[PDB]
Curated annotation (Swiss-Prot), chain B:
UniProt-listed InterPro entries: KH_dom (IPR004087), KH_dom-like_a/b (IPR015946), KH_dom_type_2 (IPR004044), KH_sf_prok-type (IPR009019), Ribosomal_S3_C_sf (IPR036419), Ribosomal_uS3_bac-typ (IPR005704), Ribosomal_uS3_C (IPR001351), Ribosomal_uS3_CS (IPR018280)
Function: Binds the lower part of the 30S subunit head. Binds mRNA in the 70S ribosome, positioning it for translation.
CDD domains in alphabetical order: KH-II_30S_S3
PROSITE patterns, sorted: KH_TYPE_2 (PS50823), RIBOSOMAL_S3 (PS00548)
Upper lineage: Bacteria, Pseudomonadati, Pseudomonadota, Gammaproteobacteria, Enterobacterales
Subunit-structure text: Part of the 30S ribosomal subunit. Forms a tight complex with proteins S10 and S14.
Protein name (record): Small ribosomal subunit protein uS3
Annotated GO CC locations: cytosolic small ribosomal subunit
Record organism: Escherichia coli O45:K1 (strain S88 / ExPEC)
GO biological process terms, semicolon-separated: translation
GO terms for MF: mRNA binding; rRNA binding; structural constituent of ribosome
Gene behind this protein: rpsC
Family matches, as NCBIfam families: rpsC_bact (TIGR01009)
Swiss-Prot record, chain E:
Whole-protein coverage range: 697 to 796 of 1342
Originating organism: Escherichia coli O157:H7
Complex and partners: The RNAP catalytic core consists of 2 alpha, 1 beta, 1 beta' and 1 omega subunit. When a sigma factor is associated with the core the holoenzyme is formed, which can initiate transcription.
Job of this protein: DNA-dependent RNA polymerase catalyzes the transcription of DNA into RNA using the four ribonucleoside triphosphates as substrates.
Name the record gives this protein: DNA-directed RNA polymerase subunit beta
Sequence similarity: Belongs to the RNA polymerase beta chain family.
Annotated gene: rpoB
Source superkingdom: Bacteria
């Protein structure tokens, strides 16, 4: 089975990507597993915002890396190849893995 | 240092990001560095061309730049002569295949950054700062800004004691997150010192 | 004095410097129509500047296919010539 | 020019057409018989006109 | 290409110099983006001046009535042409005929 | 004499529109009046519009 | 009220493009009404994808010429305007054509994505003659209906696009020719019924039963203004 | 020879085909002439005169 | 791909047996579709007794 | 109108 790991910072974008991938899968092949949402990584950062000194002065940023696990149960001839030409939107790191 | 940055507070809601890519902890810093480089280069090059926003977007080991500029004609030059030239240098800077797109900025009086730049230029060529500020404000208003504020600071008219002066017109709500507040800044490197120019331009509120 | 080929078109705002380069003149190609600017060509002393800059006639569109220039030995900026 | 040809073809007659010599209760059903496809534009007919 | 012509289209389209009628016959090299390059058969070819004929195509330019005079090659690459044959179709011509 | 000599060559592409003039080879002049849709054209029984 | 209802009984495909379809059974006199109405709707208002913006590298305007090719750039834009594309999921896609070497450039050389299907693998575009020549165009395929031309789409376009993108006119309708015939139906107990034999000729991209279903929905939702309100 | 060439192609000999109307879907009476005329666009264009 | 639905703007009732259903606006070449379809149905298919 | 709509009621979406 083809496991697909979508990773992105924007959630909407990721969602869009996932849908597209599903569409790509579903026309060619059959029995797409589904878009399973894994836990989001909220990598936080604190920094001092003064140039020199003021330690209680701080900004707390974060990067929300979202995960989408799409799986394809039956890899056909037509389906797997379809993704080669079918590149997804920018800012979405995909990671296909058969078996 | 009272105020929060108006762009920065709104990135999740009404404002988008400039650099728009994903990368793991391994390659992220490098990517950032590259972005910094390319942007710097672009600024250096297209100073005379009125450039507002460089938007970098890299999918699949290939960098896509998008230059928002008021006059594409001077950035493009002859059809695909200057752009092409820019591209290879961009690629070199990055170390990947480059692709430059050029967005045409409708209404450069409403783009905040551009306005700021203009003001800075004016300051440099020894105009009355106040008159410049007025012009900036007025023009924006004429163009259909719901509001505009501009602020200039330090060594105004080469005076020994530095001060800040600012002109607002219309409404410029900063606490309201859903307000499209185009904020940007610039610096006039005059004979007496630097003169920092801030400008806020309120396009309107977004409803979603 | 002589007239001048510069983009630094007056009174008219960020609606002059557009289909041209930083040193003046239409930048080639483009979807130009009526009321555009092709060759910034205006003199000072003619707060006493004017707009003789040859523009596009009323009602026509088009694409700049070719620009010829055997101008007064000097047309150049610091270097395109 | 066009309109006199349209009239001269309209108000004319031929010795046999669809609906030769049928009788019609008004000009409204004359146009209704022309449009439905049961008579011809020139087919001689007793009508009742007012 | 007028479907109902008189056959005098050929003579008018050749004799008015809007098409690039071949000077010396032969084959073709067809760089053509810039110029048709015709290799000359040996019988029509001079002993010195080895020689291959390079025809200049006049692309999009102004006529006297603001119309567009433009020549397009109507021969492919590696194709025999004879002396007096046409190579590039001018304005209002279709394979050497006259298409107003 | 002449100093600044800049010639710019535009190229308009004009299509066809209500008001142009077309003509055959026989003297049949015409000002193209209505630019109809494809559907309203008189089609023969094969299906092709005129 | 002794009326009936028709169904699509037999749908024969004479080829991939030219394909007839029956309709059975129609009432007396309804044949020319439904045939002419479905003709007008099926010729005016069908959705089909077409080429809108073409982006060739190392180009200034569409009236230039290029290194290593036969057709000039206006010829390339015309041959691209004739293209027949069939997308499934999205409504706006970007293809890619890259090819070098001596020989013609078919439509089968476009590096397809997954959800785009180019249904004419012998559509010629270019004739590359130099082996050192290359061509890399990036097409943009929207989806609409009717005819929207370059002049009106010169200011209509809102998304501020950069300069260098050649604008091709949009021929969106994938139906080119349609004829209907009202035969005599072969009904085992009725003689006053008829069949409608619609003979479509498509662009290859549209499915005829889907086209007839969409035209029927267009006609029904247009007539709902007569049905509901007065 | 025009008639004989129209018989080589499968066209009617009179030169005239029955044509339907795109608006009403119904046949024009008295069959009309369809053919191919070589029509020219003269350089008297309407957006040089308006 | 969204179509223009109209509003029925007028029933100018001239007499008890007269009407004029002014109706606007439709897509280009749809007024003839609706009008011809309704006209043929109202002529040759509407049920009733006499 | 409802005669034609019920006539076309079969093959719609």
């Amino acid at each position: 089975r083809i496991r697909i790991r979508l990773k992105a910072f924007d959630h909407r974008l990721i969602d869009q990507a996932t849908a597209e991938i599903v569409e790509t899968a579903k026309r060619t092949g059959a029995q797409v597993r589904g878009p399973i949402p894994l836990p989001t990584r909220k990598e936080r950062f604190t920094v001092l915002i003064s140039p020199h000194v003021n330690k209680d002065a701080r900004d707390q940023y974060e990067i929300r890396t979202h995960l989408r696990l799409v799986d394809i149960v039956e890899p056909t001839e037509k389906t797997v190849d379809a993704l080669m030409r079918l590149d997804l939107a920018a800012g979405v790191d995909v990671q296909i893995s058969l078996g | 240092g009272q105020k929060v940055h108006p762009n920065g507070i709104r990135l999740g809601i009404v404002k988008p990001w400039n650099s728009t890519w994903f990368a793991n902890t391994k390659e992220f810093a490098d990517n950032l560095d590259s972005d910094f480089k390319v942007r710097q280069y672009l600024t250096k090059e297209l100073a005379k061309a009125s450039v507002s926003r460089i938007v970098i977007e890299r999918p699949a080991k290939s960098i896509r730049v998008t230059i928002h500029t008021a006059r594409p004609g001077i950035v493009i030059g002859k059809k695909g002569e200057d752009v092409e030239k820019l591209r290879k240098v961009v690629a070199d800077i990055a170390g990947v295949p480059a692709q430059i797109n050029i967005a045409e900025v409708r209404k450069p009086e409403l783009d905040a950054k551009l306005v700021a730049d203009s003001i800075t230029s004016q300051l440099e060529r020894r105009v009355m700062f106040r008159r410049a500020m007025k012009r900036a404000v007025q023009n924006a208003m004429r163009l259909g800004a719901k509001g505009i504020k501009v602020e200039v600071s330090g060594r105004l008219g080469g005076a020994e004691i530095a001060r800040t002066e600012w002109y607002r017109e219309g409404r410029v709500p900063l606490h309201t997150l859903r307000a499209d507040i185009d904020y940007n800044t610039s610096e006039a490197h005059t004979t007496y010192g630097v003169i920092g120019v801030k400008v806020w331009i309120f396009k309107g509120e977004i409803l979603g | 004095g002589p007239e001048e080929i510069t983009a630094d078109i007056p009174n008219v705002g960020e609606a002059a410097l557009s289909k041209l380069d930083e040193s003046g003149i239409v930048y080639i190609g483009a979807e130009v129509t009526g009321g555009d600017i092709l060759v910034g060509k205006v003199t000072p002393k003619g707060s006493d500047v004017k707009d003789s800059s040859l523009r596009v006639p009323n009602g026509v569109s088009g694409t700049v296919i070719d620009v010829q220039v055997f101008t007064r030995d000097g047309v150049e900026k610091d270097k395109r010539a | 020019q066009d309109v006199v040809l349209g009239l001269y073809y309209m108000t004319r007659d031929c010795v046999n057409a669809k609906g030769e010599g049928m009788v019609l209760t008004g000009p409204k059903e004359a146009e209704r018989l022309y449009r439905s496809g049961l008579a011809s534009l020139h087919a001689r007919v007793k009508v009742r006109i007012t | 290409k007028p479907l109902v012509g008189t056959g005098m289209e050929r003579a008018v389209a050749v004799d008015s110099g809007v098409t690039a009628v071949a000077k010396r016959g032969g084959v073709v090299q067809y760089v053509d983006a810039s110029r048709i390059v015709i290799k000359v058969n040996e019988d029509e070819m001079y002993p010195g001046e080895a020689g291959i004929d390079i025809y200049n195509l006049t692309k999009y330019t102004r006529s006297n009535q603001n119309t567009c005079i433009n020549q397009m090659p109507c021969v492919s690459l590696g194709e025999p042409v004879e002396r007096g044959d046409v190579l590039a179709d001018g304005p209002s011509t279709d394979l050497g005929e006259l298409a107003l | 004499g002449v100093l600044k000599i800049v010639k710019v060559y535009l190229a308009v592409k004009r299509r066809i529109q209500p008001g142009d003039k077309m003509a055959g080879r026989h003297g049949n002049k015409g000002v193209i009046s209505k630019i109809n849709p494809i559907e309203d054209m008189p089609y023969d029984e094969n299906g092709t519009p005129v | 009220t002794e009326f009936l209802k028709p169904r699509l009984v037999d749908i024969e495909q004479v080829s991939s493009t030219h394909a007839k379809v029956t309709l059975e059974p129609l009432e007396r006199g309804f044949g020319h009404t439904l045939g002419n109405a479905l003709r007008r709707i099926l010729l005016s208002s069908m959705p089909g994808c077409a080429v809108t913006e073409v982006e060739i590298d190392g180009v200034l305007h569409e009236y230039s010429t290029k290194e290593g090719v036969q057709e000039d750039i206006l010829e390339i834009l015309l041959n691209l305007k004739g293209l027949a594309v069939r997308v499934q999921g999205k409504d706006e896609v970007i293809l890619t054509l890259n090819k070098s070497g001596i020989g013609p450039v078919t439509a089968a050389d476009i590096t397809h994505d997954g959800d785009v299907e180019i249904v004419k693998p012998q559509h010629v575009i270019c004739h590359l003659t130099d082996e050192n020549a290359s061509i890399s165009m990036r097409i943009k395929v929207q989806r609409g209906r009717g005819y929207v031309p370059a002049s009106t789409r010169i200011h209509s376009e809102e998304d501020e696009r950069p300069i260098g993108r050649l604008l091709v006119d949009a021929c969106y309708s994938p139906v080119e020719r349609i004829a209907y015939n009202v035969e005599a139906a072969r009904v085992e107990q009725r003689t006053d019924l008829d069949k409608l034999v619609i003979e479509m000729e498509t662009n290859g991209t549209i499915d005829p039963e889907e086209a007839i279903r969409r035209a029927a929905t267009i006609l029904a939702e247009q007539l709902e203004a007569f049905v509901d309100l007065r | 020879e025009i008639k004989e060439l129209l018989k080589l192609g499968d066209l009617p000999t009179s030169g005239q085909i029955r044509l339907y109307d795109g608006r009403t879907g119904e046949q024009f009476e008295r069959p009309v002439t369809v053919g191919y005329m070589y029509m020219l666009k003269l350089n008297h264009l309407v957006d040089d005169k308006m």
